[PDB]
Amino acid sequence: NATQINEELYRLLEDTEILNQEITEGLLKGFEVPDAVAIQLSKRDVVYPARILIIVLSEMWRFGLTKQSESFLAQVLTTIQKVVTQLKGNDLIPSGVFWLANVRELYSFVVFALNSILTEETFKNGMTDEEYKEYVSLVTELKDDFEALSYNIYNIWLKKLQKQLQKKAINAVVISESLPGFSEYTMDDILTFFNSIYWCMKSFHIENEVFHAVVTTLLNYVDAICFNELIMKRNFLSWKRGLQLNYNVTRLEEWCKTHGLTDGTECLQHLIQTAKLLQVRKYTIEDIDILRGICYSLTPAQLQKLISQYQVADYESPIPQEILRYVADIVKKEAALSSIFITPETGPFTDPFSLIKTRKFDQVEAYIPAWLSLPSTKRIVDLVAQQVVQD
C-alpha cells in the first residue's frame, strides 16, 4: 500500500541495531572492488556504498530521525576509517582508491545538503529557528566530520604506499642492473606499481589533482630514500652504476611524461644529478666546476662524499689529488659561509581533495546492488523507490 510506505520505511530506519549491523559489517567491511588496463566503469559501479548511505541518511533526515542518524554516521565513520587502516598487501592500491572515491562522494552530498539549507529560502522559512539551528549545527558538524575522514584515510593509505615503495624501490633503483647489451625487485615492479595507481585512479573517476599530489609525494619519497641509500654506498659508486641509475631514473621520467606528469623531473632531481656526477669526467678542476654547475640541488658536502667514494675501473684514470684538495677547500669555504642526508617526507600531508571545488551533487537513483546480502537495506531502498514515485 502507498498508505503504509513511509510508515514501514520509518519503522525500518528507527532500528539502528539491525541497520547498523548490515551497513557496517555487510556493506562496508564486506565490500567488493570492481575490475579496473583500459576497462570502462560507470560511476554507479564504484561508489555503491556511498549511494546507499546517502539514501538511508536522506530518508532519516526526512523523518527527523536526528539522534539515530548521528549514531549511524558515527559508526559508519569509525568503520570506514578502520577498514582503510586494515588495508595491506596486493589490494593496498585499488581498495584504498576505492574508498577515497566513496568518502569523497559522501562529502559532496553533505556539502550540497548544507548549501541547500543556507541558500534555499524554503528551508530557513519553513521551520522553527530552533530546529533550523539544530539542523545547521548537525549538517555542518557532519561536513567537517567527512573532511576529517578523507584527510585520515588519505594519509593512512599514502603512508602504506610509502611503506611498500621503501621495500621495492631501493633495490629496484639503486641495486638492480639491466643495461642494453651488457650480458628481489626490479624497475618493472615499480612501473607496475605506479601503473596500478594510475589505472585505478583513472577507472574510478578520481580528480587528476589528487593523482598529481600522490605521485609527486611518492616520487620525492623514492628520490630521498634512494639518494640516502646511494651516498652511504661504498665500493659500489662506479661509472657503470651511474649509467644504470641514469637509465632507471630515465624510465621513471618517461612514465611521468607519458602519463600527464609535468613536474616529475624535479622530484627525482637528486638521483638524476647523482647519476650525472657518476658519469661525467672528473679529472680537471674545470670538470669539477662543471659538476657544480650541473648538480645545483646537491650540496658541496654531498658532492665531496659522492666523489670521495667513487670507484675507478680498470683502464680508467684515477681522480687527481689536486681535485680532492680542491673539493675539501670548497667544503671548507662553504663551512665558513645541516647533514649530508635528505629528510624523507613521511607525513602527514595536506589532503589534495581539500583544495578542489567539491563535486556538484546530482540526484541519486534508488538502487542497491543485487549481489549484496543486506535484507533490511534492500527493503528500505525498494520502499524509497515507490515513495519517490508517489511524490
Partner: peptide, 15 residues
Amino acid sequence: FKKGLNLHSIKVTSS
C-alpha cells in the same frame, strides 16, 4: 512543529 528536511536526493527512472 518539525517540518523535517526533505532534500529530494533520490530519483526514480523507468525505461
